[PDB]
């Protein structure tokens, strides 16, 4: 029938409509977990030659440079290796290296 | 529109985020990386096989400072003098 | 003609399909190479004022930063198997104070070395 | 990648195959039913 | 009927697109003889480089070779079958509409 033609089609269109519904809602998500705003998300950004900035503090554990890393600075600046009330030890083997906040 | 603003804001070209990739483990990161503000750590173990470096253009100001931030030892490796201020220092050998 | 009003009327409805279609699988795309989870991008979180990393961030290319911290509770440590150096230049680029901590024995190589007290 | 977004290729094709059809919901089937006068033509355009 | 012409078409368009994509990416692929198998690398400007093993590959010709020949012959077939679908939910909406 007609009729039953044209209500298939209408559940058609409610099915296609809740699945639009539920990929905004994922869009939204993904928009906010990684915290983006009309700038962007306020972790990062890529720069256009390839030098992935950072915007802000990171806390990135344990490191383990592979190939050619080394740690540098920037121009005209001061590396500033600071221990917040913690001790800095180069270590290698049996030699250490320990600065304490009082010796 | 929105999705392709995320498309442009992060770069998500055919290989993932950009140069960065992310695996079980953690970050690879196969472009440079310099930060505006100041980054955290907890060790860095450089595998065997290579030599961890610590380079700048001016002096390499290694401090230390207590709850107030204040200094207390301080070792700058500067052009000229590698100054090593404290309250001490000391050498020792294996056996003590 | 209603007839060609309802035959444009769900090609535009087909317009609207193949445009959900593409967008749910460009979503899960953005899904699959982000790891994503509630926390965060991956397995780190980006936190609202900065961003917790749990695991090996191997750099297989240089870094840069200005100051480079220790966690509050955790003393950092720095080592390897050959040696680890500390460099710095001059105007020139010429690497001029070096404290090198060899496979035995520390070096210092400089002008000159002082040690102060705290004031 | 290539085996999920690929997956949305065919949408083409979907869209192909539904553009031929729509250009054809007449041309599918002239004829259609009720065949009477089918050796002749009966058509006006001028009110007489 | 319908529903497994239009199910042939759809698988038969998906391995035209593998295919394809697979033809694309063995053009751009430099290989090298490892003992009985094949590494093949990509050129790179870094120095670094992915590379992919072929494993119980005596010589990469077979794969340079006969390998894209296949590809060429099954895409071929692929889109002849998805034509073939497609003409056949043709007729069959021809008569059935
Ligand atoms: C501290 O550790 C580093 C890294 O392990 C040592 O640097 C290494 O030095 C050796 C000896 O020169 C290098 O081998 C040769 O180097 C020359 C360049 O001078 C190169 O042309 C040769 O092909 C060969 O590689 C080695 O490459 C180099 N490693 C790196 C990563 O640069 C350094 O010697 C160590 N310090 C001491 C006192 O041993
Ligand atoms: C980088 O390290 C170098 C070497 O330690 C620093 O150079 C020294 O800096 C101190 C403090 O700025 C200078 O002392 C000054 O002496 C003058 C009198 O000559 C006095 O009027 C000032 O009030 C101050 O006490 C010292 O002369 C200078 N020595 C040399 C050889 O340069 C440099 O300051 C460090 N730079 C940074 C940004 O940390
Ligand atoms: C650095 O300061 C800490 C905190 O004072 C010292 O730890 C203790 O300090 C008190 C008072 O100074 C002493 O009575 C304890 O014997 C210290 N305990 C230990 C385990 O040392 C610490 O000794 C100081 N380090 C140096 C090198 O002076």
């Known amino acids: 029938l007609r009729g ?43 720069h256009e030659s390839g030098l992935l900035r950072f915007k802000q503090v990171s806390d990135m ?33 049996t030699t250490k290296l320990s600065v304490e906040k009082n010796k | 529109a929105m999705t392709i603003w995320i498309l442009k ?12 990739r992310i695996t079980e483990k953690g970050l690879k990161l196969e472009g440079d990386s310099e930060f505006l503000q100041p980054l ?21 100001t290694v401090n230390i400072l207590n709850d107030q931030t204040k200094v207390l030892t301080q070792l700058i490796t500067g052009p000229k003098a590698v100054e090593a201020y404290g309250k001490k220092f000391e050498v020792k050998t294996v056996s003590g | 003609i209603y007839g060609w009003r ?16 593409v967008n749910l699988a460009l979503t899960i795309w953005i899904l699959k190479v982000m790891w994503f989870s509630p926390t965060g991008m991956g397995h780190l979180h980006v936190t609202k004022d900065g961003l917790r990393l749990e695991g090996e961030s191997e750099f297989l290319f240089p870094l840069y930063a200005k100051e480079i911290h220790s ?13 680890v150096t500390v460099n710095a230049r001059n105007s020139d ?17 400089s002008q000159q070395f002082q040690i102060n007290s705290r004031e | 990648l290539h085996t999920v977004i690929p997956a949305v290729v065919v949408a083409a094709i979907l869209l192909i195959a539904g553009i031929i059809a729509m250009i054809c919901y007449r041309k599918k089937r002239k004829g259609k039913l009720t065949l009477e006068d089918q050796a002749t033509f009966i058509k006006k355009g001028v009110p007489i | 009927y319908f529903v497994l012409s239009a199910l042939g078409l759809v698988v038969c368009v998906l391995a035209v697109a593998f295919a394809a994509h697979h033809y694309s990416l063995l053009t751009h692929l430099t ?35 006969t390998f894209q020949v296949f590809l060429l012959v099954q895409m071929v077939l692929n889109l002849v079958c998805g034509l073939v679908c497609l003409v056949a939910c043709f007729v069959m909406w021809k008569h059935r509409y």
């Open chain 1, 4 to 46: 039953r033609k044209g209500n298939l089609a209408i559940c058609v269109i409610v099915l296609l409509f809740l699945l639009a519904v539920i990929n905004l809602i994922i869009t939204l998500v993904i928009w906010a977990v990684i915290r983006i705003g009309p700038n962007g998300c306020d972790s990062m950004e890529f």
């Open chain 1, 61 to 93: 554990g344990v490191i383990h440079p592979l190939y050619k890393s080394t740690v540098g600075g920037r121009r005209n600046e001061n590396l500033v290796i600071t221990g917040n009330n913690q001790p800095i030890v180069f270590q290698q083997g």
């Open chain 2, 9 to 20: 804001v992060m770069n998500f070209t055919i290989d993932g985020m950009g140069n960065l």
């Open chain 2, 40 to 60: 955290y750590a907890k060790e860095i173990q450089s595998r065997p096989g290579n030599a961890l470096y610590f380079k700048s253009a001016r002096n390499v």
């Open chain 3, 6 to 21: 309802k035959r444009c009327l769900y090609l535009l409805v087909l317009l609207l399909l193949i445009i959900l279609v």
């Open chain 3, 71 to 83: 966690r509050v509770d955790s003393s950092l440590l720095l080592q390897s198997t050959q040696n």
């Open chain 3, 93 to 109: 680029g010429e690497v001029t104070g070096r404290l090198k901590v060899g496979p035995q024995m520390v070096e210092v190589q």
């Open chain 5, 31 to 65: 290989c090298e003889n490892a003992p009985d198998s094949c590494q093949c690398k990509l050129p790179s400007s870094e120095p670094l480089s992915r590379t992919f093993v072929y494993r119980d590959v005596t010589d990469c010709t077979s794969i340079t070779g």
